[PDB]
Amino acid sequence: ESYPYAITNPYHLSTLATLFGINAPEVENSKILELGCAAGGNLIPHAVLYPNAHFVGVDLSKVQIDEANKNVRALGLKNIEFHHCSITDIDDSFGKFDYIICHGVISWVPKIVRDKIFKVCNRNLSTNGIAYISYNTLPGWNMVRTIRDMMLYHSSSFTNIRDRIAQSRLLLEFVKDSLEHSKTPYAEVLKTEAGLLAKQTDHYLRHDHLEEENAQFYFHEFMNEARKHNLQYLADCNISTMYLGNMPPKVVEQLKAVNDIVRTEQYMDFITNRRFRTTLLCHNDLKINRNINNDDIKKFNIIFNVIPEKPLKEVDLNNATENLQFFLNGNKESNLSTTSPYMKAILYTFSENLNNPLSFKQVTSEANTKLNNTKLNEIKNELLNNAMKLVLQGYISITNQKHRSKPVLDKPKTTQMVIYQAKYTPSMWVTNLKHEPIGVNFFEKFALRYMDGRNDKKAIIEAILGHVEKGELTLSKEEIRKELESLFTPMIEKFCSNALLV
Amino acid sequence: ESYPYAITNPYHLSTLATLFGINAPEVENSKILELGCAAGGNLIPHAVLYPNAHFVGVDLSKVQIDEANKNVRALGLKNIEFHHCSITDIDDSFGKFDYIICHGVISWVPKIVRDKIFKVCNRNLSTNGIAYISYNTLPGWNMVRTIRDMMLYHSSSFTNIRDRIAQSRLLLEFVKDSLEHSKTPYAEVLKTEAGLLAKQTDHYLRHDHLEEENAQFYFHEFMNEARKHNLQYLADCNISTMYLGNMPPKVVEQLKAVNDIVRTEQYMDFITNRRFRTTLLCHNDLKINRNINNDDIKKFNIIFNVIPEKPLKEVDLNNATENLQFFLNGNKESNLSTTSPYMKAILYTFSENLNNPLSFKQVTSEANTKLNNTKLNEIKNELLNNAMKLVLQGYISITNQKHRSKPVLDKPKTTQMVIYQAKYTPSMWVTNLKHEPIGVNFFEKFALRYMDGRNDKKAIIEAILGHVEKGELTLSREGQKIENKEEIRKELESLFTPMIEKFCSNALLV
Ligand SMILES: Nc1ncnc2c1ncn2[C@@H]1O[C@H](CSCC[C@H](N)C(=O)O)[C@@H](O)[C@H]1O
Ligand SMILES: Nc1ncnc2c1ncn2[C@@H]1O[C@H](CSCC[C@H](N)C(=O)O)[C@@H](O)[C@H]1O
């Protein structure tokens, strides 16, 4: 189970670099390095997308690297190589990379390897390159460490990994039952954290990992190390963690009064109990511009994943007594509502383009055709006044990736990575065109096996029919017929709006 | 400022020893050692109370030990020694002690000194003696450490201790400002913690104290160190921290099943976020009896400090359907109510005996007089069935201390220690007979100066009046001053009766 992590997508690093006034290299011709890449699930899909780029993963585990290379051979990729070696084996002969991704390693490795990671992110980084390093942080990690301590101390039962996992689990359940009637805040925190741990699979409970030491960085100590290597802080990959606007305005003005972003970020870590950071680093020499304005939205392609409570053909967009509701990435609650004809036209245009970025001009022109082409100015005004605020709060995505051609649904066609995963892989998820893991059931997976752009609906349904009778697939003959076709159109919608169709 | 800590009282250690089947040494002739005694405010009041007991303090700070010796000399005590030396200087020549008190020390000292504290608590402890060691604990200490890390980080502004203090205060208020509207639970925990910290004085916030390393014990790690020295866990001095009865029965059954008290205690620390322990240890070879029965209440004198909502003379206790309310140490917020006439009679009896220990026979016979002396057996049954449960939950105090004879309020007489504190010391608090600091206002402190067991009420009032006229005490009406000789005499006579009640109920009168 080697997952892609969308937040490490080189196009995301490049986007964030653009936001802050850095011109990062074009992704399609770039060179990309992943440190501690495991079996390559966070790297291989990019190699498939960008045959003109070059990819290098490094991991100390020979079994993971062997699995990486097996999938490389299977996909026919000529642009990617995996090396079984330590990070500490990397030297100047590896060359310079435009993007360096190190996700979930630096907290778990000894000091000599942490120092090496910083040194590679300097020496092997291109002039305008971007380095990603993610790590656990105090104060938020305290609670996790406590539970690990708890599970180790009560786990002296037997010697086996397997046997010990079961009593770790029933210790989590025992904790739940213990706190049943407790109203204190700490009981609430511990109960939720234990519930999370219980949900996880055995690889995360296995006690050899529980015993592993975490570096327990504070942000300012991490940055101390990065600055020793002449790297400066660019951004967190979730920019909403940098948002100061939900705080009292005197406080915000005071935070701006001192100008250093590391101290401000550390302060926010202290008062928010921050447990994890996904940090972007770049070379000291670059001049970063943190002054962001509304018009900056025009620099980017935009995604706002919103689902309207009422369909478009049932509403009159110029009826301003009607407050219409849109659910964000979903949904119920966690939502927004508008009375504006212009904001309605904008939100309806985003809801037809889910996970398919639109330029400022594309969004506003398409919304204007819903307003009879008369409103372009008012629409541009409404988007300008709002977009960047919602981006900085994390509701809207910006990307340097371009709008994708509308998929043709007569003969639905998924991607090379996805067809491969559906045919040859046991996992119940696939990697979409945004480098996001998308969960699928058995019906959706078997159906993805057949979307090459050739087979029509009847053909795909028949190919799946080969699978149901000899399972393989079992759906929870005529009932099977229209049960299968009732599942078809919603599946196509899910694939088309989750960037699984080409 | 050197406070007494009532929880370290050797009579409290002895009481807990008795609860668990240990016969600890008689307090009045004992030998008592305090490690890291600072200025001796936790030791000196016992030397005053127990002329036939011997007391030894040890502290590394010359300034503190000098203050302790100044107060010993001021009090004229011959039974107490204060030594300026390290705990590492203690050896077999110091002799054996029946009680050893180490409070707020071991978490703050290097590993070698911690080793030595355990060693002393074995080698210098009498056969039946009790050692007390308190320390900060994980997981609860995480938050405190975090705030200290924050303060040190956010004030690094070179070179000025007072200015660094001002920056740390500014920081803490800035925190409170930042979290105002935010409703998340972490924000609330942090908010009140920084509130406590802002409340304190400058010596707790000085960066050199913030930089000091805490040992950060888990309980099982503390007990591992104690066991190396052949010390076993007796109990926590707040026994309510040991109580499992508020947890689901199946959980309580599993905990009871594992039959390891140190593991059970650790589990409770994890699920309650325990931040501090006050631990009693004793030699490994003593047989500790953990089976506690209702009738064990008969072994102890008892205090339950309850204030009735309604005066006894306004209620009929024999009424069984009326719900009567009682407020604990306090209160009006935290209370206990009952319709039982027998529990009512017991509760009014405790309310008349505040902070004065009562035997089982005393509680039940006095309760019976309220029920017309026909109820003795029912009242004994009520106390039997509820008392030890309330003890283990922390509501009722048990003590090996004797019942004290009633103070005669005619010529009120306070104790040697508090008459010293009131006359000769700047502090606004005094140390009562139970080793508790009791806050006093200016009128109460002045009054205490004059209660020698000779001055009657008229003479005490005349003395205080002299202070009001000398300019050293002012009385607000309020908020206009009351300046006329008569009418200040009037007001003083108004204030005297509740003051004598408060002293009487706070164990300040002999
Ligand atoms: N010194 C070293 N050099 C190269 N890889 C290392 C290393 N030390 C640890 N690793 C690798 O670092 C990884 C940490 S687990 C994280 C793996 C992957 N990025 C993911 O999130 O799924 C493991 O695959 C381990 O084999
Ligand atoms: N090695 C050592 N030997 C003797 N005293 C020490 C010591 N290390 C620290 N101390 C003393 O331990 C005390 C810690 S502060 C706690 C003091 C006191 N028990 C109270 O609670 O008020 C300080 O007075 C310090 O001087």
Side-chain angles (χ1 to χ4, degrees), chain A residues 5 34-38 58-61 64 85-88 103-105 109 113:
Chain A
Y5 303 95
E34 187 167 20
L35 274 12
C37 62
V58 170
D59 200 285
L60 230 201
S61 166
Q64 306 297 335
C85 66
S86 182
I87 278 149
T88 60
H103 180 74
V105 348
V109 293
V113 177

Side-chain angles (χ1 to χ4, degrees), chain B residues 3 5 34-38 58-61 64 85-88 103-105 109 113:
Chain B
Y3 290 92
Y5 304 99
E34 190 172 22
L35 272 12
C37 63
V58 161
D59 199 281
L60 253 201
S61 168
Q64 304 303 328
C85 66
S86 181
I87 287 160
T88 59
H103 179 80
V105 179
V109 296
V113 181

Side-chain angles (χ1 to χ4, degrees), chain A residues 142 149 178 186 218 267 270, chain B residues 145 149 178 186 218 267 270:
Chain A
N142 284 310
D149 293 337
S178 289
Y186 176 81
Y218 279 116
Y267 176 71
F270 275 130
Chain B
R145 196 191 67 250
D149 290 340
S178 291
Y186 174 81
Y218 281 110
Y267 177 72
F270 281 125

Side-chain angles (χ1 to χ4, degrees), chain A residues 135-156 164-182 184-252 254-255 257-258 260-286 288-309 311-312 314-331 334-416:
Chain A
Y135 48 96
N136 316 92
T137 60
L138 307 174
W141 212 63
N142 284 310
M143 180 84 270
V144 181
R145 193 191 63 249
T146 297
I147 293 176
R148 294 161 61 95
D149 293 337
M150 188 180 198
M151 290 183 309
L152 289 163
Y153 174 72
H154 294 297
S155 58
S156 73
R164 230 173 156 180
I165 300 217
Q167 54 91 236
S168 276
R169 298 193 179 284
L170 62 74
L171 186 274
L172 296 164
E173 212 61 39
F174 192 57
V175 165
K176 166 168 162 268
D177 301 5
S178 289
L179 294 175
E180 194 79 85
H181 310 323
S182 305
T184 53
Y186 176 81
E188 210 64 54
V189 181
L190 180 56
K191 272 191 287 191
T192 70
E193 215 59 31
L196 278 185
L197 236 62
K199 254 45 175 177
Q200 298 179 12
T201 77
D202 296 33
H203 180 245
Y204 298 71
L205 285 67
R206 67 169 293 171
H207 317 272
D208 199 27
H209 164 58
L210 294 184
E211 287 164 26
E212 290 186 290
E213 254 180 319
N214 196 284
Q216 301 198 81
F217 284 119
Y218 279 116
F219 184 52
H220 77 273
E221 312 176 315
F222 179 87
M223 282 315 302
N224 247 293
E225 290 273 288
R227 303 218 251 243
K228 262 168 217 157
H229 290 83
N230 292 295
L231 296 163
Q232 66 178 312
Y233 181 60
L234 169 60
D236 194 274
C237 279
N238 299 108
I239 53 172
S240 65
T241 61
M242 309 175 68
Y243 185 60
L244 270 2
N246 283 321
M247 307 263 298
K250 358 85 77 177
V251 181
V252 177
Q254 268 156 116
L255 282 185
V258 305
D260 162 36
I261 187 62
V262 178
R263 285 195 158 269
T264 289
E265 291 272 47
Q266 184 62 75
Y267 176 71
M268 287 305 283
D269 278 9
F270 275 130
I271 64 185
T272 64
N273 201 28
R274 183 81 178 262
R275 52 166 56 186
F276 196 70
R277 272 173 171 276
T278 60
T279 301
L280 293 190
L281 265 26
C282 63
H283 277 311
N284 259 2
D285 285 6
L286 291 175
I288 289 166
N289 173 15
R290 305 203 176 273
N291 188 274
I292 309 294
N293 286 86
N294 297 319
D295 99 285
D296 296 341
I297 195 72
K298 306 186 172 201
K299 265 179 273 189
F300 303 101
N301 301 311
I302 307 164
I303 294 172
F304 198 2
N305 288 325
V306 286
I307 297 197
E309 174 188 30
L312 175 51
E314 304 188 319
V315 299
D316 173 10
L317 296 193
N318 294 103
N319 176 358
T321 46
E322 195 170 12
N323 192 30
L324 293 188
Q325 298 206 21
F326 298 79
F327 303 128
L328 329 195
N329 279 286
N331 225 4
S334 159
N335 80 320
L336 97 166
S337 312
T338 184
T339 210
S340 170
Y342 318 129
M343 189 48 77
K344 290 175 194 173
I346 288 166
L347 288 184
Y348 273 109
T349 297
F350 283 124
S351 71
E352 302 169 331
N353 288 273
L354 309 175
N355 290 312
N356 193 0
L358 295 165
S359 71
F360 186 82
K361 297 180 178 301
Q362 294 181 294
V363 186
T364 57
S365 299
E366 282 194 31
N368 193 35
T369 71
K370 300 180 173 85
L371 296 183
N372 192 29
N373 296 316
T374 263
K375 284 331 193 305
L376 188 66
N377 294 319
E378 293 91 333
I379 289 163
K380 287 196 188 169
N381 170 258
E382 260 272 49
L383 221 214
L384 241 288
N385 286 338
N386 285 289
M388 258 305 167
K389 190 224 69 152
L390 295 169
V391 169
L392 294 172
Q393 293 171 4
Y395 295 117
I396 291 185
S397 297
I398 49 177
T399 186
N400 284 343
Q401 301 180 101
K402 279 308 178 307
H403 187 64
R404 307 189 306 271
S405 304
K406 300 308 162 138
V408 166
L409 288 345
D410 329 357
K411 305 148 216 303
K413 183 187 175 86
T414 188
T415 74
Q416 189 190 344

Side-chain angles (χ1 to χ4, degrees), chain B residues 361-378:
Chain B
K361 295 194 191 285
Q362 283 177 307
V363 177
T364 55
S365 57
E366 287 192 55
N368 200 26
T369 72
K370 298 170 172 66
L371 295 199
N372 282 31
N373 289 336
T374 61
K375 295 311 185 191
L376 186 52
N377 292 358
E378 297 81 353

